Design a protein around this motif. Structure first.
Motif, PDB file in Angstrom:
ATOM      1  N   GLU A  98      53.044  82.024   7.096  1.00  0.00           N
ATOM      2  CA  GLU A  98      53.271  83.454   7.255  1.00  0.00           C
ATOM      3  C   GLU A  98      53.322  83.798   8.735  1.00  0.00           C
ATOM      4  O   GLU A  98      52.403  84.428   9.265  1.00  0.00           O
ATOM      5  N   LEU A  99      54.394  83.376   9.403  1.00  0.00           N
ATOM      6  CA  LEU A  99      54.541  83.605  10.843  1.00  0.00           C
ATOM      7  C   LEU A  99      54.499  85.082  11.200  1.00  0.00           C
ATOM      8  O   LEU A  99      53.970  85.472  12.242  1.00  0.00           O
ATOM      9  N   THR A 100      55.049  85.899  10.311  1.00  0.00           N
ATOM     10  CA  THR A 100      55.186  87.342  10.523  1.00  0.00           C
ATOM     11  C   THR A 100      53.831  88.018  10.650  1.00  0.00           C
ATOM     12  O   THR A 100      53.703  89.127  11.144  1.00  0.00           O
ATOM     13  N   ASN A 101      52.828  87.303  10.183  1.00  0.00           N
ATOM     14  CA  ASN A 101      51.436  87.671  10.268  1.00  0.00           C
ATOM     15  C   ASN A 101      50.816  87.330  11.605  1.00  0.00           C
ATOM     16  O   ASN A 101      49.681  87.685  11.880  1.00  0.00           O
ATOM     17  N   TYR A 102      51.584  86.606  12.414  1.00  0.00           N
ATOM     18  CA  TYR A 102      51.161  86.145  13.736  1.00  0.00           C
ATOM     19  C   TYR A 102      52.089  86.680  14.830  1.00  0.00           C
ATOM     20  O   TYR A 102      51.645  87.070  15.904  1.00  0.00           O
ATOM     21  N   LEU A 103      53.386  86.690  14.536  1.00  0.00           N
ATOM     22  CA  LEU A 103      54.410  86.944  15.539  1.00  0.00           C
ATOM     23  C   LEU A 103      55.326  88.100  15.178  1.00  0.00           C
ATOM     24  O   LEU A 103      55.564  88.378  14.000  1.00  0.00           O
ATOM     25  N   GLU A 104      55.857  88.753  16.202  1.00  0.00           N
ATOM     26  CA  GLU A 104      56.863  89.782  15.992  1.00  0.00           C
ATOM     27  C   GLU A 104      58.168  89.115  15.598  1.00  0.00           C
ATOM     28  O   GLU A 104      58.417  87.948  15.959  1.00  0.00           O
ATOM     29  N   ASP A 105      59.000  89.844  14.856  1.00  0.00           N
ATOM     30  CA  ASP A 105      60.307  89.330  14.442  1.00  0.00           C
ATOM     31  C   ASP A 105      61.157  88.866  15.610  1.00  0.00           C
ATOM     32  O   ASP A 105      61.859  87.874  15.495  1.00  0.00           O
ATOM     33  N   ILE A 106      61.119  89.603  16.719  1.00  0.00           N
ATOM     34  CA  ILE A 106      61.912  89.230  17.881  1.00  0.00           C
ATOM     35  C   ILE A 106      61.410  87.913  18.472  1.00  0.00           C
ATOM     36  O   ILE A 106      62.198  87.128  18.987  1.00  0.00           O
ATOM     37  N   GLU A 107      60.111  87.654  18.364  1.00  0.00           N
ATOM     38  CA  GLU A 107      59.564  86.407  18.897  1.00  0.00           C
ATOM     39  C   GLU A 107      60.024  85.215  18.051  1.00  0.00           C
ATOM     40  O   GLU A 107      60.400  84.168  18.586  1.00  0.00           O
ATOM     41  N   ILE A 108      60.012  85.391  16.731  1.00  0.00           N
ATOM     42  CA  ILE A 108      60.465  84.369  15.789  1.00  0.00           C
ATOM     43  C   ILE A 108      61.941  84.079  15.969  1.00  0.00           C
ATOM     44  O   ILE A 108      62.361  82.915  15.988  1.00  0.00           O
ATOM     45  N   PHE A 109      62.720  85.148  16.116  1.00  0.00           N
ATOM     46  CA  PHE A 109      64.158  85.031  16.379  1.00  0.00           C
ATOM     47  C   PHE A 109      64.420  84.238  17.661  1.00  0.00           C
ATOM     48  O   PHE A 109      65.214  83.288  17.667  1.00  0.00           O
ATOM     49  N   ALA A 110      63.746  84.624  18.739  1.00  0.00           N
ATOM     50  CA  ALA A 110      63.852  83.902  19.996  1.00  0.00           C
ATOM     51  C   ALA A 110      63.471  82.424  19.845  1.00  0.00           C
ATOM     52  O   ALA A 110      64.090  81.563  20.448  1.00  0.00           O
ATOM     53  N   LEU A 111      62.439  82.142  19.061  1.00  0.00           N
ATOM     54  CA  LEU A 111      62.006  80.755  18.863  1.00  0.00           C
ATOM     55  C   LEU A 111      63.113  79.927  18.220  1.00  0.00           C
ATOM     56  O   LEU A 111      63.383  78.806  18.654  1.00  0.00           O
ATOM     57  N   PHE A 112      63.764  80.476  17.194  1.00  0.00           N
ATOM     58  CA  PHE A 112      64.828  79.753  16.506  1.00  0.00           C
ATOM     59  C   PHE A 112      66.023  79.470  17.432  1.00  0.00           C
ATOM     60  O   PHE A 112      66.515  78.343  17.492  1.00  0.00           O
ATOM     61  N   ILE A 113      66.505  80.497  18.119  1.00  0.00           N
ATOM     62  CA  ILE A 113      67.590  80.324  19.067  1.00  0.00           C
ATOM     63  C   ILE A 113      67.192  79.347  20.171  1.00  0.00           C
ATOM     64  O   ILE A 113      68.015  78.546  20.628  1.00  0.00           O
ATOM     65  N   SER A 114      65.934  79.419  20.606  1.00  0.00           N
ATOM     66  CA  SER A 114      65.442  78.500  21.625  1.00  0.00           C
ATOM     67  C   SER A 114      65.477  77.061  21.122  1.00  0.00           C
ATOM     68  O   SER A 114      65.848  76.155  21.872  1.00  0.00           O
ATOM     69  N   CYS A 115      65.113  76.856  19.859  1.00  0.00           N
ATOM     70  CA  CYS A 115      65.194  75.518  19.258  1.00  0.00           C
ATOM     71  C   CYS A 115      66.620  74.999  19.342  1.00  0.00           C
ATOM     72  O   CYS A 115      66.839  73.838  19.703  1.00  0.00           O
ATOM     73  N   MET A 116      67.590  75.857  19.015  1.00  0.00           N
ATOM     74  CA  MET A 116      68.997  75.458  19.070  1.00  0.00           C
ATOM     75  C   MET A 116      69.396  75.004  20.465  1.00  0.00           C
ATOM     76  O   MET A 116      70.151  74.038  20.619  1.00  0.00           O
ATOM     77  N   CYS A 117      68.898  75.716  21.470  1.00  0.00           N
ATOM     78  CA  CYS A 117      69.342  75.516  22.857  1.00  0.00           C
ATOM     79  C   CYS A 117      68.468  74.559  23.687  1.00  0.00           C
ATOM     80  O   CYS A 117      68.809  74.252  24.827  1.00  0.00           O
ATOM     81  N   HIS A 118      67.335  74.117  23.151  1.00  0.00           N
ATOM     82  CA  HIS A 118      66.251  73.667  24.036  1.00  0.00           C
ATOM     83  C   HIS A 118      66.508  72.343  24.782  1.00  0.00           C
ATOM     84  O   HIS A 118      65.808  72.052  25.741  1.00  0.00           O
ATOM     85  N   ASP A 119      67.493  71.550  24.342  1.00  0.00           N
ATOM     86  CA  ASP A 119      67.853  70.301  25.044  1.00  0.00           C
ATOM     87  C   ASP A 119      69.325  70.272  25.440  1.00  0.00           C
ATOM     88  O   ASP A 119      69.909  69.215  25.591  1.00  0.00           O
ATOM     89  N   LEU A 120      69.924  71.447  25.601  1.00  0.00           N
ATOM     90  CA  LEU A 120      71.342  71.564  25.933  1.00  0.00           C
ATOM     91  C   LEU A 120      71.785  70.707  27.096  1.00  0.00           C
ATOM     92  O   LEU A 120      71.172  70.741  28.172  1.00  0.00           O
ATOM     93  N   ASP A 121      72.851  69.939  26.867  1.00  0.00           N
ATOM     94  CA  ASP A 121      73.452  69.076  27.894  1.00  0.00           C
ATOM     95  C   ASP A 121      72.516  67.975  28.409  1.00  0.00           C
ATOM     96  O   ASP A 121      72.656  67.512  29.542  1.00  0.00           O
ATOM     97  N   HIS A 122      71.558  67.575  27.580  1.00  0.00           N
ATOM     98  CA  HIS A 122      70.675  66.453  27.901  1.00  0.00           C
ATOM     99  C   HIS A 122      71.526  65.211  28.174  1.00  0.00           C
ATOM    100  O   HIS A 122      72.502  64.970  27.463  1.00  0.00           O
ATOM    101  N   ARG A 123      71.167  64.418  29.182  1.00  0.00           N
ATOM    102  CA  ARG A 123      71.973  63.236  29.494  1.00  0.00           C
ATOM    103  C   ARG A 123      71.324  61.918  29.061  1.00  0.00           C
ATOM    104  O   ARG A 123      71.830  60.849  29.377  1.00  0.00           O
ATOM    105  N   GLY A 124      70.212  61.997  28.344  1.00  0.00           N
ATOM    106  CA  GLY A 124      69.544  60.802  27.866  1.00  0.00           C
ATOM    107  C   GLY A 124      68.585  60.232  28.896  1.00  0.00           C
ATOM    108  O   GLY A 124      68.222  59.064  28.833  1.00  0.00           O
ATOM    109  N   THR A 125      68.169  61.063  29.850  1.00  0.00           N
ATOM    110  CA  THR A 125      67.211  60.641  30.867  1.00  0.00           C
ATOM    111  C   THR A 125      66.114  61.690  31.039  1.00  0.00           C
ATOM    112  O   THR A 125      66.330  62.861  30.751  1.00  0.00           O
TER     113      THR A 125
END
Ligand SMILES: CNC(=O)c1ccc2nc(C)c3nnc(-c4cc(OCC(C)C)ccc4Cl)n3c2c1
Ligand SMILES: [Mg+2]
Ligand SMILES: [Zn+2]
Length: 339
Positions: A98-125
């Motif tokens: 129950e994340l909504t019991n801990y976090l605001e919706d905008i925080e949860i939304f940001a977390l998901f988008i951040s997961c998508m982006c969090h290793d962008l253009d990683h070169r394997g190093t």
């Protein structure tokens, strides 16, 4: 481009239609064909009601999704399928805790988008290499540390600021800013040094008990959740942890080889002639992965099974460690490898 046309015109598939088990911790998102993952990203956002909630433009979200996907390179581990499975785990947290019991919706939304982006253009190093390599990224970022993570955030900014990809641009200037600060905080939180830095704050929070009116508890929890997403290949079955070890060390050893070619000596875990995988994997599980899922467990009692699974996988590694010692003859029946 056909991915684009389909994502724009086919409609968002219900998650149940992807897999009956799609929202279960037992589901392995890496089983999804890579071609279907952008669609699954939209399905997950739709199922969490964020598209309607935040009045997201679907064409814009589609474009953004594909930009993020094509923003990953193809090293053995830090590729789009990693970002996707990390994002899917974020979704699993939403559905099962129950994340909504801990976090605001905008925080949860940001977390998901951040997961998508969090290793962008990683070169394997890793971050250490960029320095030793004299890469452009080190020049840009080394004096502040978290070199790759700063680059991951900058890439996310670059994507958001590409025409037709700014999924947030209807947000108030206040909420738009919060989203950038959240994404920066969260993506910077994926640097192991950051995690080590905040660890005893995470413990203290777990001890005193989470406080929803404490906004720095929100921030800490966001970091904890982000790291638990990053490491979530450890929460599936043995085959997933085995396969991901293989991808990780393939990537690591490719870095080590490069460090040797430029006349430097890699960390032991990067050196295919020194690295002893069971020991290294067991250490990583005991010192990094398990403490993270234990904190997750201390905060969310329903996350106990995640911790138990990681621990169980750790014990599986101890049980197969002996196999890295050649007893009897090799499958060759030959000792030619000695010469
Ligand atoms: C110094 N040791 C390492 O960097 C290391 C060693 C062994 C690993 N083994 C597995 C299975 C693994 N899975 N993800 C990562 C991982 C995590 C990263 O940051 C994520 C935050 C939460 C800390 C960054 C890079 C990686 Cl590769 N790792 C390992 C990381
Ligand atoms: Mg990373
Ligand atoms: Zn990652």
């Amino acid at each position: 481009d056909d991915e684009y046309t389909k994502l724009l015109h086919d409609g968002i598939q219900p998650v149940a239609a992807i897999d009956s088990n799609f929202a279960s911790f037992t589901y392995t998102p890496r089983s999804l064909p890579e071609d279907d993952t952008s669609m699954a990203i939209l399905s997950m956002l739709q199922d969490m009601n964020f598209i309607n909630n935040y009045k997201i433009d679907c064409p814009t979200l589609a474009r953004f999704c594909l930009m993020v996907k094509k923003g990953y390179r193809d090293p053995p581990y830090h590729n789009w399928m990693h970002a996707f499975s990390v994002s899917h785990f974020c979704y699993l947290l939403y559905k099962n805790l129950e994340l909504t019991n801990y976090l605001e919706d905008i925080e949860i939304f940001a977390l998901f988008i951040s997961c998508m982006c969090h290793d962008l253009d990683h070169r394997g190093t890793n971050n250490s290499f960029q320095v030793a390599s004299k890469s452009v990224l080190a020049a840009l970022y080394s004096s502040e540390g978290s070199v790759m993570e700063r680059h991951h955030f900058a890439q996310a900014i670059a994507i958001l600021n590409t025409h037709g990809c700014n999924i947030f641009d209807h947000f108030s200037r206040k909420d738009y800013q919060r989203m950038l600060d959240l994404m920066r905080d969260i993506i910077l939180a994926t640097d192991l040094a950051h995690h080590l830095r905040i660890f005893k704050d995470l413990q203290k929070m777990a001890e005193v008990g989470y406080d929803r009116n404490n906004k720095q508890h929100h921030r800490l929890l966001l970091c904890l959740l982000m790291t638990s997403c990053d490491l979530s290949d450890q929460t599936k079955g043995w085959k997933t942890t085995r396969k991901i070890a293989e991808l990780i060390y393939k990537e690591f050893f490719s870095q080590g080889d490069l460090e040797k070619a430029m006349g430097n000596r890699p960390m032991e875990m990067m050196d295919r002639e020194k690295a002893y995988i069971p020991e290294l994997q067991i250490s990583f599980m005991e010192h990094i992965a398990m403490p993270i899922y234990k904190l997750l467990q201390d905060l969310f009692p329903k996350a106990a099974e995640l911790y138990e699974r990681v621990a169980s996988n750790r014990e599986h590694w101890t049980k197969v460690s002996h196999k890295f010692t050649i007893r009897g003859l090799p499958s060759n029946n030959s000792l030619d490898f000695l010469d």
